[PDB]
Design an enzyme around this catalytic site. Structure first.
Site, PDB file in Angstrom:
ATOM      1  N   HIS A   4      -7.769  -5.897   1.311  1.00 46.04           N
ATOM      2  CA  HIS A   4      -6.791  -5.288   1.491  1.00 46.04           C
ATOM      3  C   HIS A   4      -5.606  -5.360   2.363  1.00 46.04           C
ATOM      4  CE1 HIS A   4      -5.033  -1.065   0.573  1.00 46.04           C
ATOM      5  NE2 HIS A   4      -5.087  -1.326   1.608  1.00 46.04           N
ATOM      6  N   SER A  25       0.629  -1.436   0.479  1.00 46.85           N
ATOM      7  CA  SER A  25      -0.291   0.095  -0.224  1.00 46.85           C
ATOM      8  C   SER A  25       0.977   1.465   0.276  1.00 46.85           C
ATOM      9  CB  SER A  25      -1.127  -0.023   1.198  1.00 46.85           C
ATOM     10  OG  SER A  25      -2.003  -0.630   0.745  1.00 46.85           O
ATOM     11  N   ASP A  80      -9.972  -6.141  -2.887  1.00 48.73           N
ATOM     12  CA  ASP A  80      -9.998  -5.037  -2.328  1.00 48.73           C
ATOM     13  C   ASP A  80     -10.357  -3.975  -2.543  1.00 48.73           C
ATOM     14  OD1 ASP A  80      -8.175  -2.995  -0.979  1.00 48.73           O
ATOM     15  OD2 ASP A  80      -6.144  -4.313  -1.219  1.00 48.73           O
TER      16      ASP A  80
END
Ligand code: NA
Lengths: 261, 275
Positions: free
Chosen positions: A238, A86, A210
């Site tokens: 996620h 991320s 996600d």
């Protein structure tokens, strides 16, 4: 500043960069042991804005890229393999842009390379939440984490959900000036053109369910990267790497074993 | 027009009126909206299709909605009794019923206690028990209300978006723009009514009780629904002796609004065969 870090094993070095709000510790329940068993040396650390530096504000992506660089230098492990998720993928991506010589290859999970609408919506909602000063009650908060982070498959599973709810008490996420500032370490512009100059082999992993960073945005990073290729994990939210560790580690390890140090 | 019918007496011994709408002259269908939804939520995509198929459509405002938004202290039995009262008032027993979510749950309970009022039913986005995650979502939602704490408007809109729509819609930016503008035209007001509707859910496993329901039933699950997952709906169809399951791909919790044509086609096909 020098940041807290955590050095295990001997061998080809791999540096893990966590996402927003995550400490080095995030990599230890599921990633580090599997990498150690495969012979790697693992480095995890606390991003700026985390832990000892949770009151840090005014820092940017660029500050975070230099922190990571400094770490790679201070330990004399250049070039390292780099695993990021991320915000961590975004820091990895940008490090490879300014300092390609520091990284031999990378795995980037749940990443993007431009300011797409999902990201804007999230940037607005999160920033607003912080400036309002509002405290969500814990159960409502645990519910948002659950829906934000896991696959449908997981939520349908009574034993898992009890665990993931329990597990939230062992991973308290405090709202901090650091956590607010990490919100800004995200793409602001199209970064894909800059990414077309990255030589290093890279694996991009998208998690199928996600919603914070939907898979298709990872395909886009994989396409911009000359040596990039994209992989998708079915039934992962996620936090795919925590939820489907075996499928995720096997993929990072087959990939890392295929490239040179 | 402004039609009203008399609801059941509540457990605090009050009797209110509830609004309803009545269109067409054909075979009567009673629509039961979900939690937060007024009767008018069936008007954009359901009612025109049913009128063009020769059905008469009854919609109404559940207790705790619109004019009764300050109602509190009611239970699932109160709403079931209200639905029965609407049926008995129009003298349309046994009626076709369509329910979504909380409204599907009210239809299930109505069929358990008053089977002669209902000829056949379509139940969308339903369940006959709360699993661990759903139990928890219910508790979280109750806690939020009870705490007094208001969600900032952008956070609120994002949450609403993610909870209700399919990944297909969520990935399409123009579509997302459309629905968030729509949210402004269907604002969900936070009210004692809404809070009370939160407890018209199974508190126990009702699937056993559904085993005695004889009426033909079509249960529709939406593949991307996370407020009531498709598997809970399919447990309900498994329970019902004459229930059958259908799943709409690429539909979130609001499938009947997002994929109206697939939903409608399946309901009209089901209603043409029943009994
Ligand atoms: Na059945």
């Amino acid at each position: 500043i020098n940041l807290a870090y955590d050095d295990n094993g001997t061998g080809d070095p791999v540096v893990f960069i966590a996402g927003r709000g995550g400490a080095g510790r995030t990599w230890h329940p599921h990633q580090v042991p599997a990498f150690l068993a495969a012979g790697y040396r693992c480095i995890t650390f606390d991003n700026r804005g985390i832990g000892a530096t949770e009151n840090a504000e005014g820092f940017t992506t660029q500050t975070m890229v230099a922190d990571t660089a400094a770490l790679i230098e201070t330990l004399d492990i250049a070039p390292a393999r780099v695993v990021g998720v991320s915000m961590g993928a975004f820091i990895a991506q940008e490090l490879m842009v300014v300092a390609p010589e520091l990284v031999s290859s990378a795995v980037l999970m749940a990443t993007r390379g431009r300011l797409d609408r999902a990201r804007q919506f999230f940037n607005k909602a999160e920033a607003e939440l912080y400036d309002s000063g509002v405290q969500l009650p814990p159960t409502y908060d645990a519910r948002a984490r659950l829906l934000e982070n896991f696959s449908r498959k997981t939520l349908n599973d009574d034993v898992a959900v009890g665990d993931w709810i329990a597990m939230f008490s062992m991973w308290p996420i405090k709202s901090t000036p650091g956590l607010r500032c990490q919100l800004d370490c995200a793409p602001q512009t199209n970064r894909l053109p800059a990414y077309r100059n990255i030589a290093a082999p890279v694996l991009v992993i998208g998690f199928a369910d996600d919603v914070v960073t939907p898979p298709y945005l990872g395909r886009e990073v994989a396409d911009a990267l000359p040596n990039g290729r994209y992989l998708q994990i079915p039934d992962a939210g996620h936090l795919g790497f925590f939820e489907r560790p075996e499928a995720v580690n096997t993929a990072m390890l087959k990939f890392f074993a295929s490239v040179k140090a």
